[PDB]
Amino acid sequence: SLCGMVWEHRKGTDYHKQPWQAKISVIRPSKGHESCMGAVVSEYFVLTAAHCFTVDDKEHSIKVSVGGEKRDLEIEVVLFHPNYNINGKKEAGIPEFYDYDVALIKLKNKLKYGQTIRPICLPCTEGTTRALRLPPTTTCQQQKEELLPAQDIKALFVSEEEKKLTRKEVYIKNGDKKGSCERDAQYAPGYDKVKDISEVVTPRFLCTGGVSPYADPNTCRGDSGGPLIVHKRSRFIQVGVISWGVVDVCKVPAHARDFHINLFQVLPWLKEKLQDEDLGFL
């Protein structure tokens, strides 16, 4: 199959429209389960946020499903980015630090691509170069400048509300608005007294949300971990992983920013872990 390509037909389920979307549920007796999403990136892997796994039990507590299927898929192992350390800045007044908040769920059984289950394209891969109908002289830097220019980048994410999946169009402030977007991180939970924001907002994050240039929808609690996508040439390319934000409105607007791990900033990890998935990383 061709990554980031959807069913060329009308109607169909929410998974005909977003075949790459995966649902993740981490369950515990207390009933305060984690709810997250991810994206199929190959037949054996699902990419999502590292912070979703708060119960270290891949055998019976992590429920992963795709294609709107009801069955939960067998997990071989969950790989956490090596630099991830959520409590690493506790002593500096940062309760939860989300740098490198990405993880890959490796499935025991190979996924079978259909009209409701298909991979999404990843940065600096052969699939993305072809999806964007670019020539083979295309490099990783070129893909980056093509997908993430120094401006307000049009992008989207998939949100679930009332049993329904919907695309939410947002704008990544990667240009002159970047700074003001990142600075609103001061309004995120536990960050009240964080003097320098660069300490909670590292060069591994993309910033969306706000009312400028437009009134951007915000990620819902359950959407955490899902892909942040750039829609180009009728193809879907994942550029980030939803990680955290200022507020959950699905439940001051100009302050409603969401942060995502920029996949261009965790390529050595991705390239190494998915080196056997025939995705052709550059």
Added chain:
Amino acid sequence: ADPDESQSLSLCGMVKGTDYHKQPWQAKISVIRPSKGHESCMGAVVSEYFVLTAAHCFTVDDKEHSIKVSVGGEKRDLEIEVVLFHPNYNINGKKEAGIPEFYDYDVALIKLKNKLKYGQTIRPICLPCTEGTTRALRLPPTTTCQQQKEELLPAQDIKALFVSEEEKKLTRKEVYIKNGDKKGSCERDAQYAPGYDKVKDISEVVTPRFLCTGGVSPYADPNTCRGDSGGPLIVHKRSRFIQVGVISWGVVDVCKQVPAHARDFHINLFQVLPWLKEKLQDEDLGFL
């Protein structure tokens, strides 16, 4: 006399108006984090400086900015001096044994910085083995702790309730604690709870510090919602409300499969009286 009388306001377990007039002891607790996966729990005002709830609720070590506590329907959040966790509590205590989360001694006390000013919407609930409870029960002044137990927790199906929240409003749910011959059946269903798939001996997860509700016998019992966790398990013994437990965990949440297996577990306060008695020794509670 005037109901706002200071002495009349300090009377535990007593009750038109909003739903907070109906449940004056109810406390709301939110542990927020940037990822948006906030913890939601409830608690009970036990005294002027303390709110009792579950230990598992505190997943962000930041009482300064990430733990929001409110009472009396107030939209304001209260400053926290310190959060006290039962010394025997350790959710990872049996990880190596195949048990992901262990909820033994799942209780914690929130010590507020400022005194709670009791009122028409803010009032403490009665705690086991205290001067207050003996009176609420209409028992002679000679009553002992064991006597109160036999009075509140008989070896049978014990009528009880917990306060649940569904769509902005709070409501009382009648449940039955299986403390008699249905006790074993109730506890054995713990086998169907998250992560307990391979638990052979149920005693490993359901320790003698737990009360068991839920199921369809003797009656179809309602279950606790994720957000009701850490909330007080109460006995409505004749116009008075006594807290006998702290909601800890359960097999399933069906708010907002196999109904007969739907059990909820609560930490029996009688099993943590030594902790309660001590930590609350300066709160003028009259512990027997």
